[PDB]
Symmetry: C5
Subunit: 377 residues, 5 copies
């Protein structure tokens, strides 16, 4: 994830232009190899046309260039790129929206599951560890960085996400499918055992716990779905064919012809086709947006920081269910205890953001007395 | 389903270009017959123009070609293809989103329904089998592969999805509609009987079970809706007419005219119209995206693997409600038992993904002392 | 509803081309009158230009045709058609998504409301009849076919959807608005009376019943909203003006001028403007998509089969709450009773769809021993 | 709201053409002033060019017209209009979707709150009046018609939406913000008092009541949000600048030049530029779609009928909670009491809509005996 | 936030034209620096071409200008701007939709948590203060104005959002991540303590409270997600490159060439390229829409008024849970006590908005007696 949110907080002078001086997650980093290949091919074709062809062959090449340049069209490539990249970006944000966060569940575990003794603490930690274990089980299946961190389930044992007993239990339950769903059944059965043991006082709290757990299950199932059901290969190949055919025909039709032949539109030899190169940067960077976002769980600069998410979820969940269980700050009267209209102060740097309330768009509508009286019937 | 998610994890050099060397679910596999027909028609017209027409007829054909080539427009076909294919892809992902997964329901069945004896085990298995039976009943109605697997309900009896008693009960309840909804009523009545029999301890657990069951019912009803209410035939015919008229007029207007006549734009005879063929690949592959995704439950390469889904759901549901009922791994203190900030290790292959936390975009905003003081009033 | 889902299960050779040989819900059925009017007007203008004008008048007509043909633009019509038809299709599928289905509610009524005697059976039937009566009350207000079936509420009395007592009660409660909401209040009060009478054992079941009832109420209210708040007339008129002005200027600018005058682009007289006719079919069929889907409750071929939905809902609801109440198939051990990994068989026609499981995209990532070891700290 | 849903029930011959003969909510009603201004400016410029310029000045004007006509582009205006109007229409339908309807809440109030005496009736009426008061408080803030109906809260007192006691209570609770949220807190506290007083028998009914109340609160908050956070002014100004610059350059570049000068494309003087006027109607009507829908709570023809909604909600809510509380029609056996497959009759006008059921798209798949047998293993 | 909703209530004569006379949040305010830079560069290039080049150099510059003007294309920039700005606007409204509002939660806190004594009042205030503290903790992380108001947590202590005890408790729980989630765990544990202490009478009320709290948690987590996961930098750079390359090539190709050379399209020297400047305003304002909305929590004119939201939420929440707890207006019979069809009056200014009810689109369908009779069978 490359974050530049602070750099674009305001629409200042050339705010998006300052983003062009970036390297991580940039157009250049994703495009330099393709651009160098295009450069080499274009200049090889140029040198062949200049110093490697006869006069008749050069005339034939000029006819070919004039024919190719008339078939270079911006409409199909722009249309398919816009629609395909919109689909890719929508799926990318949907994939982020299904990344599981155990915060609601950990709040309910810290609240509902009672007992400051060792058994209740162990129960809360085991429930939240089941949640985190299911999350990491799906993330090591969908994310290459998490898989590199945990190449096997024994790595999850060494990393504290799974106990040897849980590892053996998962080995007993081995079916020829992905077993990320097992910790959810473990969570349901353990919560049932907690409610039957008196640790959960009411079954409505059990229902809330299992509702949050099932929401996490749905998110992980959607992550598995996005990992499994790719965007159809035919669509990706259509977009790739469009872009690459466009620039293959630019590899010939955008060649600068001999200015001594007085060709229409080729009277000037600039050597470097800067407009073709700008089109290359724009179009192949538009393609690279999809090429980077199509699997947001890889190892690109703009890919999701899934290992950080796993670590943060584990730490925060364990702290919430273990150290923060019934550990409250002292409940004391606040600053606005007997002040019916609290007015928190503003700093000197924020005094300009003190704004009057918007009372609705109809507040300033002016009406005279005659038209404000209620008409009978 | 053709999965290439691992191949596009990173935006590497020509990552989408390596996808062009695929055959299953590719442009070529979906396009070779149409392209061969187009090739044959184009070259037959070419040979008729060359060696089967008089001089006046050839001049008339040249006039016709010049007239047809001026009416070849990229705007309508690209517009209608973009919007129609966007609709098709949206409906395709919606159809996947309504494929039923019994994991939440099977967790609730494994937890709520009590009893390690034969009767409670039979009750849990029968409930989860009702869920899977309803799912397979709608899937054999919407999917051609599932229907080929189960041409009749007696095949479902031989496959263990339905007992002979359930088959006879469904035969008694025969109405002149699709009877996929029956197992949901069976599930509701059986869960009510379980709650009245003491197997379900509280009616809130019954409510949760029936909520998950009704969610599965809504998903199956949406699958039936997508199978019944197709995209309107007029829209599909509009897109088909656009594409096929475009290439019917390319069948004549893209013919290479006689270079001895010195026609503008036809001074070169390349024999093979590679740009027309690239346009054909692009546009008819864009059409084939819709032609493949319009019914994602058929037997295409990119169609859903519904038989695998049915088998996996049956196996996982039966294992969850039967073998995993109150079968928990030993609850033991974890690795981070008394470690308030757990730090799971990273492998050498994943040490570069250890990242500092993003504390918000306002964290690096610099303010001096004077503008940080709270102003009075 | 015209269903061709089985015909487009696979992306076969010309699968969308075979849909062009259809008549119901086709382009031709929705377009033949407009196309005949366009044909007659075009050929009348042609005959006026040929055999009804002087030489100077013919020259003036040729100038007018050359001026009109330069203002025939594809961009505005395609843009507005794409966006407007996308809006129409989205609203059409939203209107289908709000068609009420009582299956969840009927499952909850069959389960929760107890009593195999006459009173409990009457109670269940009356509740589900209130649901179906509200559905049919909104559908006879939004659908022309349902209104033709039930022109008055007395027709609903003769059709069994309403009793004479309910008809008199609705006549007492007559307000100058649509009274489709009344059966929902009836359902709520009857369910409260059932819970107070002991027929509903717990108020949580009452809450579930009323939640499903309120979901049906929201769907019917959305149907009323879509019937009331049309797409704004200005937008529809904008699209209509665009299309009809395009073809009014094609009625003159696409006329074949005299070939003896040697006009650029008019050197050939084809008599029949096949490309203008293909554009007419495409564009006015794109318009007809919106013209058919804008009110999906009318009597078009692709309009919703609302009368069938009403009949199916009534039959299925009455069967579910009356005959299927606590009427369960015998609960017996299944085929996979002691088989921990069930494997249902495949037919010879479906053996090719037996697929291995997708274990995640990271499953085939290769790592050596050195980079798989956990690094310290 | 202009409703033409009945006029577009079928895709008949020129169904959208018959909508062009409308005046309320039409293109002409929203466009006549702008079109007359454009007409006057165009003909003033025409008369200046004809009878108010010297020969050299006329030649300079002709050069200016030829220069302006080459910069008249349809692409930017169509793109920005399509995207902006799509945003406006989406926000308009979202604003309708957040218009509060108290029907679910009034059903729950009529059911849950018990007592046919004066106190329970007063309690139900006060709860539903709190709901309607909150709705009208937000609607008089977002809608100009509702504000004209109730310029002050004392008008709400005279209109029965608020009692003098509630008006005084709201005056006591005066904060410098919009106080539409107060009746929701009133509803919550009154429902709590009702449950503690025995009028609400179970707290689950209290939860359902407050859930419906909070849904209404969310809808009203979204209405306030749409009233407050407008579409950004820069986007609206971009679209306005595009359209108005397009027609300002059409005001000169679309002038008919002198035909005696033999200008290319200006050899004919039609006086009235009908194609420029059609473009004006189309584009400025596309703009007027956004200009009318951007605030759907104003006083346009297609704006929401908010006063009718308020009146209908008040009447229906009071009738539902007061007269329909435990007032049920007599529960009697229906027409299909012992008829397991009910078949309601069809009228002669609706007999053609009797359709066979769609049993799924796989129902007609033909398989022979050999390929239907289950293969072993 | 710049609100002009009242100015666009009606589609009046030039309603969007009157918005062009605005300065705050306008095109000019966001564009004047870029436009002045473009103006200076264009006129510097103009003066170099006029008074700083030789005749051969001027001819070369004319060739360069003719070459650059043929590569100025509107299609890619318009496509990428439309799609990118649509994405930005969608994300901007999603970010507003996840701004937390404690109104539902404060209603439930005012209702459920009992006790008019000091302890219950302190409990309600502490719960609602936990909600507001979590909201302000995420808003000071995502919003620059809120961070300027509260540069540190000690500023939150001085502003009454946090007590010194809560500040010390948060300092004890310090993990190397953002600690905005802590008040949600505090809320859950405090609500559990309230229910165990008898302040919350039933656990269903506890479930409702924690459901509203978890909804607020999800909204704040989505705000954190939008702050962290920016739109990918490659897409922003693609759009920026497109726009800036378009206007860099307009900086040369739109120069007015020497009219004495008689160049096609350059026969007139207008000095000021008003059409290029209109294109600049339109396109760079379209870009500025995204440049302003990409981070809606900055300090732009159209950015969200987050400090006002924080203050309003604090005041309204404290008033609702403290002063409005069981403080109800006197429950008295209303104006329509025994009036079954209430008719609130209309003012003279609103009498035209009194409209008859829409009874459905099928209400005016005419049928004769013969076709209204039910057909047998
Ligand atoms: Ca990636
Ligand atoms: Ca298919
Ligand atoms: Ca219709
Ligand atoms: Ca309006
Ligand atoms: Ca901003
Ligand atoms: Cl799921
Ligand atoms: Cl170039
Ligand atoms: Cl459903
Ligand atoms: Cl070609
Ligand atoms: Cl509703
Ligand atoms: Cl034609
Ligand atoms: Cl809300
Ligand atoms: Cl014109
Ligand atoms: Cl969340
Ligand atoms: Cl210019």
């Amino acid at each position: 994830t490359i974050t530049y949110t602070s750099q674009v907080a305001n629409a200042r002078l050339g705010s998006f232009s300052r983003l062009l001086l970036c390297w991580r997650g940039s157009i250049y980093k994703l495009l330099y190899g393709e651009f160098l290949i295009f450069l080499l091919c274009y200049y090889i074709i140029r040198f062949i046309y200049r110093l490697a062809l006869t006069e008749e062959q050069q005339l034939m090449f000029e006819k070919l260039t004039l024919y190719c340049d008339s078939y270079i069209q911006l409409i199909p490539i722009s249309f398919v790129l816009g629609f395909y990249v919109t689909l890719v970006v929508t799926r990318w944000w949907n994939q982020y929206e299904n990344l599981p966060w155990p915060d609601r569940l950990m709040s309910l575990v810290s609240g509902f599951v009672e007992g400051k003794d060792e058994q209740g603490r162990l129960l809360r930690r085991t429930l939240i560890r089941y949640a985190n274990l299911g999350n990491v089980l799906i993330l090591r299946s969908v994310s290459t960085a998490v898989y590199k961190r945990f190449p096997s389930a024994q790595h999850l044992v060494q990393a504290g996400f799974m106990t040897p007993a849980e590892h053996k239990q998962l080995e007993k339950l081995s079916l020829p499918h992905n077993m990320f769903w097992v910790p959810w059944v473990w969570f349901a059965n353990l919560s049932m055992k907690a409610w039957l043991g008196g640790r959960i006082r009411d079954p409505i709290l059990l229902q809330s716990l299992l509702n949050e757990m099932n929401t996490l299950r749905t998110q992980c199932g959607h992550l598995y779905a996005y990992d499994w059901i790719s965007i159809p290969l035919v669509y990706t190949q259509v977009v790739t064919v469009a872009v690459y055919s466009f620039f293959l025909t630019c590899l010939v039709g955008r060649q600068f012809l001999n200015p001594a032949k007085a060709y229409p539109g080729h009277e000037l030899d600039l050597v470097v086709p800067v407009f073709t190169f700008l089109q290359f940067f724009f179009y192949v960077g538009w393609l690279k947006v999809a090429e980077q976002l199509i699997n947001p769980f890889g190892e690109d600069d703009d890919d999701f920081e899934t290992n950080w998410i796993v670590d943060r979820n584990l730490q925060v969940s364990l702290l919430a269910v273990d150290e923060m269980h019934q550990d409250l700050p002292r409940m004391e009267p606040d600053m606005y205890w007997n002040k019916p209209e609290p007015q928190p102060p503003y700093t000197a740097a924020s005094a300009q953001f003190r704004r009057a309330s918007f009372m609705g768009s109809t507040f300033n509508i002016s009406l005279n007395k005659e038209e404000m009286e209620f008409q009978p019937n």
